[PDB]
Design a protein around this motif. Structure first.
Motif, PDB file in Angstrom:
ATOM      1  N   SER A   1       0.765  -1.240   0.000  1.00 22.44           N
ATOM      2  CA  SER A   1       0.000   0.000   0.000  1.00 22.44           C
ATOM      3  C   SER A   1       0.807   1.308   0.000  1.00 22.44           C
ATOM      4  O   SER A   1       0.199   2.357  -0.208  1.00 22.44           O
ATOM      5  N   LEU A   2       2.128   1.322   0.232  1.00 20.88           N
ATOM      6  CA  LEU A   2       2.893   2.562   0.436  1.00 20.88           C
ATOM      7  C   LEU A   2       3.922   2.819  -0.664  1.00 20.88           C
ATOM      8  O   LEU A   2       4.297   1.907  -1.390  1.00 20.88           O
ATOM      9  N   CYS A   3       4.395   4.060  -0.790  1.00 23.08           N
ATOM     10  CA  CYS A   3       5.500   4.431  -1.675  1.00 23.08           C
ATOM     11  C   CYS A   3       6.677   3.454  -1.512  1.00 23.08           C
ATOM     12  O   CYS A   3       7.340   3.435  -0.475  1.00 23.08           O
ATOM     13  N   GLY A   4       6.968   2.655  -2.542  1.00 23.09           N
ATOM     14  CA  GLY A   4       8.224   1.920  -2.630  1.00 23.09           C
ATOM     15  C   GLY A   4       8.303   0.613  -1.853  1.00 23.09           C
ATOM     16  O   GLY A   4       9.348   0.320  -1.281  1.00 23.09           O
ATOM     17  N   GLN A   5       7.243  -0.199  -1.857  1.00 23.50           N
ATOM     18  CA  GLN A   5       7.211  -1.555  -1.290  1.00 23.50           C
ATOM     19  C   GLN A   5       7.446  -2.628  -2.354  1.00 23.50           C
ATOM     20  O   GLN A   5       6.601  -3.457  -2.658  1.00 23.50           O
TER      21      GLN A   5
ATOM     22  N   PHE B   1       7.728   3.668 -11.903  1.00 20.50           N
ATOM     23  CA  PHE B   1       7.579   3.252 -10.502  1.00 20.50           C
ATOM     24  C   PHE B   1       7.890   4.390  -9.526  1.00 20.50           C
ATOM     25  O   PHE B   1       7.139   4.633  -8.592  1.00 20.50           O
TER      26      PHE B   1
ATOM     27  N   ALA C   1       5.151   7.245  -9.862  1.00 17.14           N
ATOM     28  CA  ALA C   1       3.931   6.615  -9.389  1.00 17.14           C
ATOM     29  C   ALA C   1       3.907   6.344  -7.882  1.00 17.14           C
ATOM     30  O   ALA C   1       2.857   6.472  -7.280  1.00 17.14           O
ATOM     31  N   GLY C   2       5.033   6.066  -7.233  1.00 19.84           N
ATOM     32  CA  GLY C   2       5.131   6.079  -5.777  1.00 19.84           C
ATOM     33  C   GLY C   2       5.081   7.485  -5.173  1.00 19.84           C
ATOM     34  O   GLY C   2       4.466   7.699  -4.137  1.00 19.84           O
ATOM     35  N   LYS C   3       5.627   8.500  -5.838  1.00 20.23           N
ATOM     36  CA  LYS C   3       5.455   9.904  -5.429  1.00 20.23           C
ATOM     37  C   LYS C   3       3.998  10.366  -5.549  1.00 20.23           C
ATOM     38  O   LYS C   3       3.511  11.086  -4.687  1.00 20.23           O
TER      39      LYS C   3
ATOM     40  N   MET D   1       1.435   8.099  -5.158  1.00 20.86           N
ATOM     41  CA  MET D   1       0.826   7.389  -4.025  1.00 20.86           C
ATOM     42  C   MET D   1       1.009   8.154  -2.726  1.00 20.86           C
ATOM     43  O   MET D   1       0.032   8.339  -2.017  1.00 20.86           O
ATOM     44  N   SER D   2       2.222   8.646  -2.447  1.00 18.80           N
ATOM     45  CA  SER D   2       2.537   9.506  -1.306  1.00 18.80           C
ATOM     46  C   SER D   2       1.671  10.762  -1.305  1.00 18.80           C
ATOM     47  O   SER D   2       0.954  11.000  -0.341  1.00 18.80           O
TER      48      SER D   2
ATOM     49  N   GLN E   1      -2.168   9.756  -0.609  1.00 19.52           N
ATOM     50  CA  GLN E   1      -2.328   9.401   0.792  1.00 19.52           C
ATOM     51  C   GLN E   1      -2.203  10.592   1.727  1.00 19.52           C
ATOM     52  O   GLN E   1      -3.033  10.744   2.614  1.00 19.52           O
TER      53      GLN E   1
END
Lengths: 54, 54
Positions: free
Chosen positions: A41-45, B15, B18-20, B22-23, B26
């Motif tokens: 669910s989090l940034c960078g897992q 990736f 896309a994680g930035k 997600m951060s 959230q």
């Protein structure tokens, strides 16, 4: 006569290598390096998918 | 607004970005949760104020 099949089969190995794909990306040509799955669910897992040239 | 919450221009094309994204999405859920916490606690004051003034 053996060399005919040992050349045709070695061409078939490189046909498998450049032809096999997922979602149109080549998998086993050796360009599938550092390709992260996002497995939470989090940034960078991440989990990293790396495949050598085949 | 999407600017006020930092979700203006979320970029999901790799990736890392896309994680930035997600951060930011959230954090924006956390910003809208805290704003709705203020409007919740504030409507608790006013249901008590109406019960008092009446």
């Amino acid at each position: 006569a053996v060399q005919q099949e040992i050349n045709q089969l070695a061409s078939e190995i490189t046909r498998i290598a450049s032809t096999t794909q997922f979602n149109t990306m080549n998998l086993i040509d050796g360009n599938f390096t550092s390709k992260k799955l996002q497995v939470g669910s989090l940034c960078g897992q991440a989990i990293t998918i790396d495949i050598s040239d085949m | 607004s999407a600017t006020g919450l930092g979700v203006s221009g979320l970029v999901v094309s790799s990736f890392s970005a896309a994680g930035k994204a997600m951060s930011a999405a959230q954090d924006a859920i956390s910003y809208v949760s805290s704003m709705r916490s203020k409007l919740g606690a504030l409507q608790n004051r006013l249901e008590h104020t109406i019960s008092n003034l009446d």
